[PDB]
Amino acid sequence: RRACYGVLRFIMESGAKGCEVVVSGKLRGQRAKSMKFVDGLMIHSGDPVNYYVDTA
Amino acid sequence: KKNKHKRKKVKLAVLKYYKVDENGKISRLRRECPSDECGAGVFMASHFDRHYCGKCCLTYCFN
RNA sequence: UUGGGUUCCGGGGGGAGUAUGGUUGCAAAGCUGAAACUUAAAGGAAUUGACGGAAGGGCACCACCAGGAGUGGAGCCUGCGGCUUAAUUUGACCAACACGGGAAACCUCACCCGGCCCGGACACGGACAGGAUUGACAGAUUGAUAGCUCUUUCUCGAUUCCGUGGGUGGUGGUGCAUGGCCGUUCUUAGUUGGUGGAGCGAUUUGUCUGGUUAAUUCCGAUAACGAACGAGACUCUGGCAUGCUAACUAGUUACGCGACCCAGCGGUCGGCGUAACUUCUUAGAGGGACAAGUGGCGUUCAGCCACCCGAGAUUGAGCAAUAACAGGUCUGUGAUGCCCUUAGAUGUCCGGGGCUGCACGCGCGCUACACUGACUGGCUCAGCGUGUCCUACGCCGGCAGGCGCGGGUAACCCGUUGAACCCCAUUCGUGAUGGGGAUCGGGGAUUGCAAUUAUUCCCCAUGAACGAGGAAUUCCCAGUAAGUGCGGGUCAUAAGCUUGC
RNA sequence: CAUUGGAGGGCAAGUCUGGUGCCAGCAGCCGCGGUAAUUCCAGCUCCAAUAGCGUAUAUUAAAGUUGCUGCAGUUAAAAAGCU
Ligand SMILES: [Mg+2]
Ligand SMILES: [Mg+2]
Ligand SMILES: [Mg+2]
Ligand SMILES: [Mg+2]
Ligand SMILES: [Mg+2]
Ligand SMILES: [Mg+2]
Ligand SMILES: [Mg+2]
Ligand SMILES: [Mg+2]
Ligand SMILES: [Zn+2]
């Protein structure tokens, strides 16, 4: 929760329009729980997904 | 069902393939190797009927 | 910030307004009224979902209507259950079942029957140059030309071996420990914060009475305001440009020869060569359509209907939200936790078998039941796309095929891809027929290490059900359904499949 | 030679290690355990109060859950049918 927030802050401070950090897996316990950190704009559909967002 | 034992080796002593007499004698007891690969070193074997080269896999059926 | 007077009455739920006793009543019953035992909740109000054989709106050929083609009946192909087996490896039950790109001869491959191998790093200790150890012909042995073992003796020479320690491998287990990727709810229009307001709060408003739209699409209303995603835009593609850029790896026309026909600055020529050119071919750049125009309808808004003009007045896809699901995949992974095994191995190789086994049930398909046809000729038309394997031509063979020569790493060669149905002419004649081609005998080629449980291919014979398919049910509205053939994937051999044309 | 109880939450104190696998067991209450148990059985640690500390039962406060101070009685338990 602390590491993802600092990466989230470091992207928006660096001059980005919007970013998503998604961390899925065994976080607390043995059940798989996803965790998604969003701020700003984020497109999902269409051709501009091909060159406005980069994924890793 | 009993397993198969492996090839237990025979564990012999020194070679002793050399005769020596009258204070300095040359005698090649086991046979020669006509191959130029193992010549002057490797002997041949001595079975009950044949001689055999342990390297070049060559035997002579002396009948 | 708890006191006007006064009556009755409740104390978790059940047992239970039951049992007993008294009393009232003709009776039915009323009144009064326990306990043992049992139990961690029962309950009230409100909120959000879910569901309703509740009502309003609206929508979809994975829904119906009007229909079409069917499937379900038949034979076969192939997948799943079951049975059987030494083993018939296994995953999956709308959203599993021609699925795992899963068309398995061996390999694949896990399963079975057997036989080798170490590919057990490294660390320590034991051994050991008087030698650690390694490989072997010939016999015995073995499915085996595995020195695997045994007889037998020769060979390498520190690489190894023995012992604990510790690693490594695994298409082993676990998808209910997970990653990733898919699929689905969910092809519909839906979802969310900020600040403000309303509530003790969960929450709500925003995100709506109404109109409109494919759409939470807009107009408009309004304790909301301003935004965000999805929709839309966008991308590819379809359809038009006698305008542009451009062409010996694209053509056309003109012309020059050349064949042939019957005389012309005639007719045909995918005969040959070069002059202008881009119409046709290719593929770039721009253009074009916006509900723009007209008329209606509509709050005159949003929009809708019709018509003109036009190639076109909704072409088809791809991408695709929040929240999820114990959806699938550990058998895609040197993605992976934990567990199991780890040398007589669940590692790995080799050989053989199995994955095809057949009282039976189901799913996706194929070929048919014929005359709107089959047969035998004749004639004449594609488009994607692939190729170091694709193939031209010449000989040989009746056929599958063979043998020679060439071309193409490809707008260059195959290839002007001379495709089917169709079209025209024949024979048949309503008879399970010359419809149908299952089953099966015999021969012939090819691929491959190997064709048996027929790999395919070809020939000759054999000639089964089937005369339109019960109850059921699938898919579909325009170049669509259906008929019809051709590529690609898989592929040494190769399509009844799938994906494209 | 300092015990007695504990360590999921109430409630001070561990997501330690080993065993067990809805078994044995714990647990006042909610609960835990069906193969990675923060709860069982043990070791390690830690906490609490300490020459004392658990446990059973009566009882008082907590209890404005008996209400004089001070409770409720529309729908949660409940105002008699009416005078
Ligand atoms: Mg009072
Ligand atoms: Mg009570
Ligand atoms: Mg406690
Ligand atoms: Mg008391
Ligand atoms: Mg008090
Ligand atoms: Mg009370
Ligand atoms: Mg009541
Ligand atoms: Mg009353
Ligand atoms: Zn020799």
Curated annotation (Swiss-Prot), chain A:
Changing S34A: No effect on phosphorylation by PRKCD. Methylation by PRMT1 is required for import into the nucleolus and for ribosome assembly. It comes from the Eukaryota. The modification N6-succinyllysine is found at K17. It is found in: Cytoplasm; Nucleus; Nucleus, Nucleolus; Mitochondrion inner membrane. Component of the 40S small ribosomal subunit. Identified in a IGF2BP1-dependent mRNP granule complex containing untranslated mRNAs. Interacts with HNRPD. Interacts with PRMT1; the interaction methylates RPS3. Interacts with SUMO1; the interaction sumoylates RPS3. Interacts with UBC9. Interacts with CDK1; the interaction phosphorylates RPS3. Interacts with PRKCD; the interaction phosphorylates RPS3. Interacts with PKB/AKT; the interaction phosphorylates RPS3. Component of the small ribosomal subunit. The ribosome is a large ribonucleoprotein complex responsible for the synthesis of proteins in the cell. Has endonuclease activity and plays a role in repair of damaged DNA. Cleaves phosphodiester bonds of DNAs containing altered bases with broad specificity and cleaves supercoiled DNA more efficiently than relaxed DNA. Displays high binding affinity for 7,8-dihydro-8-oxoguanine (8-oxoG), a common DNA lesion caused by reactive oxygen species (ROS). Has also been shown to bind with similar affinity to intact and damaged DNA. Belongs to the universal ribosomal protein uS3 family. This is Small ribosomal subunit protein uS3.
From Swiss-Prot, chain B:
A zinc finger (C4-type) spans 33-56. It comes from the Eukaryota. Changing K19R: Abolished monoubiquitination by RNF25, leading to impaired ability to rescue stalled ribosomes. The modification N6-acetyllysine is found at K16, K25. There is a cross-link at K19, K25 (Glycyl lysine isopeptide (Lys-Gly) (interchain with G-Cter in ubiquitin)). It is found in: Cytoplasm; Nucleus, Nucleolus. Monoubiquitinated at Lys-19 and Lys-25 by RNF25 in response to ribosome collisions (ribosome stalling): ubiquitination promotes subsequent activation of RNF14, leading to EEF1A1 ubiquitination and degradation and rescue of stalled ribosomes. Deubiquitination at Lys-25 by USP16 is required for maturation of the 40S ribosomal complex. Part of the 40S ribosomal subunit. Part of the small subunit (SSU) processome, composed of more than 70 proteins and the RNA chaperone small nucleolar RNA (snoRNA) U3. Component of the 40S subunit of the ribosome. Part of the small subunit (SSU) processome, first precursor of the small eukaryotic ribosomal subunit. During the assembly of the SSU processome in the nucleolus, many ribosome biogenesis factors, an RNA chaperone and ribosomal proteins associate with the nascent pre-rRNA and work in concert to generate RNA folding, modifications, rearrangements and cleavage as well as targeted degradation of pre-ribosomal RNA by the RNA exosome. This is Small ribosomal subunit protein eS31. The chain holds residues 89 to 151 of 156 of the full protein.
